[PDB]
Every structure is written in structure tokens, then in C-alpha cells.
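User: quick one - fold this with zinc ion bound?
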Amino acid sequence: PQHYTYLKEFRTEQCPLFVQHKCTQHRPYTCFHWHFVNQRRRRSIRRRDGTFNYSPDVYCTKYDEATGLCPEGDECPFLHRTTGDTERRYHLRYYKTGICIHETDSKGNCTKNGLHCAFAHGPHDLRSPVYDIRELQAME
Amino acid sequence: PQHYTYLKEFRTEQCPLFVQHKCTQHRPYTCFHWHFVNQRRRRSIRRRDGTFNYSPDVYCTKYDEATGLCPEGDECPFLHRTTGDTERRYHLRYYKTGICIHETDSKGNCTKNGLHCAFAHGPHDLRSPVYDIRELQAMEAL
RNA sequence: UUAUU
Ligand SMILES: [Zn+2]
Ligand SMILES: [Zn+2]
Ligand SMILES: [Zn+2]
Ligand SMILES: [Zn+2]
Ligand SMILES: [Zn+2]
Ligand SMILES: [Zn+2]
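Assistant: Sure. C-alpha cells for the protein plus zinc ion:
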């Protein structure tokens, strides 16, 4: 059940090893957790009213990619282009919904995008998109 | 599988619903999260040197069971008698290492402790203990 | 494809 943990937790909290100068995954940057705020991801959520807490498609124009700060903060309804575009790649709408074009290795992981590839490697690894009620209503 | 989620997470964080009287899993207290501080457990951890962050056997005498406070907090090397004895029961050393004496119901859950039961129901549900390097030494000598 | 541009 790795999908749940990535959707809920990927890059949402700071790496405790990094603050102790002990994270081996800073360069190149491959950690599960954020090291700087400009690498922080907001958990993507579908609210009870059927809307996403933020869009899977429209990028915020005020988000400061260098500092990880948006004037509207986390309540911003638009997508933030954080490091590695992880708000989009790990969004309920898109995470693991397409097939990865890259080969799969013997442990079932991506040969090119590393352990955190957000494309699917095999049927067990594919999920159906979750849609905003507004996308569903457009699809009609 | 579900073992890792219990080991790492069970009753380690405060329930955001309970603080608002919106948790429906209080009495019968089936919530995965703590509601009162004395229900909170610290995640047990095997350090790189092979020792546990805190013992699964020797109980802290400073831990106030009424308030859930120990002066050493997460760094106390001794076991806290949290409500339901959850630090011991969900410890790496003991969680699901033995068979529950109680029976399972028709959903696959313990009849006395429900789905959260810390003993294994069926040999398929067993895990091997994780041992402190010290216990490994004493055990080998037998 | 949400990392095939
Ligand atoms: Zn790290
Ligand atoms: Zn924004
Ligand atoms: Zn891939
Ligand atoms: Zn609760
Ligand atoms: Zn203590
Ligand atoms: Zn039981």
C-alpha cells in the first residue's frame, strides 16, 4: 500500500536527518521528505463538497519558487510549482494514472525516475484518477 | 503490511476530530489516534548501534500515568505504562509476536480488543520479534 | 503522459 503513503506524505514534512547534517539524499536530491521549504508539497485533498483543496492543472502565478512562499499560503486554490513539480505529480488527479514509458527494474521500480516515480509500473501500480466535481460536470 | 502502520503510527499523534468533539470512535474507543495525553505512545525505534530507544521490559518509575508526562519525554530509555499498556504492546520487540488467546469474529477481528489487537490471530499474522543487541547477547549464551 | 519534449 505505497500509493496511500505517497499521496498523503510525500514531501509534506521536513527531513529530520537533513537538519542533523546526516541525510545522504540531499545531492542529488532524492529524499522522501523536504529539506528546504522550496521543496515542500501540500497534501492534495478532495474535500467533502467534492472540490480539490487546490487545482491539478492551473498554476499559481504568485508562488515564489525560490522561497516556497505564496501570499495566499496553503489555502491557495492553485497549483504550486515546487521542486520537482511534486504537487502535480503526486496529486490525487494524476498520481500513478498513466503508464511510465521507462523500463521497470527487478524490484518493480523505475529505471530512470528513481524510487519515487509517479507513473505506473504494472497493473498493481495503476490507479484511477480522482476528479473534482467541477471536472466531472464539465465531462457531461 | 498493516504491521508497519501500527508500529510507526498507532496512538502516536493526537486525534484532530476528538479535540472538536467530532470523533465518533471514542467509547468504544476504537480510534487510531490518542485522545488524552496518557493514551499517547512513543514509537519504539532500533538505533543504528542495535539498542532500542526505550526498553520493552523495564518500566519508567518517573512517568506520571495520570497526566502522561515523563520529565525525559521521548528520550527516556524506559518503558511508560500508557493507557492500555500500548508502548509495550506495540513495541518492535513484542507486537504480533505471539498468538492471542481470544478468538476471532466473522470479520477477522479479535473479540476482546477488536481490530487493534496487539497479538496475532493466526500464524499468518505473526511477525518475528526485533531484539535489542543486548538481548541477542544474553540469549545466545542461553 | 502528471518526468516520452
Ligand atoms: Zn532527507
Ligand atoms: Zn499560490
Ligand atoms: Zn517510471
Ligand atoms: Zn479519535
Ligand atoms: Zn520515562
Ligand atoms: Zn486478540
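One thing worth noting: The pocket of zinc ion (ligand 5) is lined by residues B 60, 62-63, 70, 72, 76, 78, 80 (CB under 6 Å).
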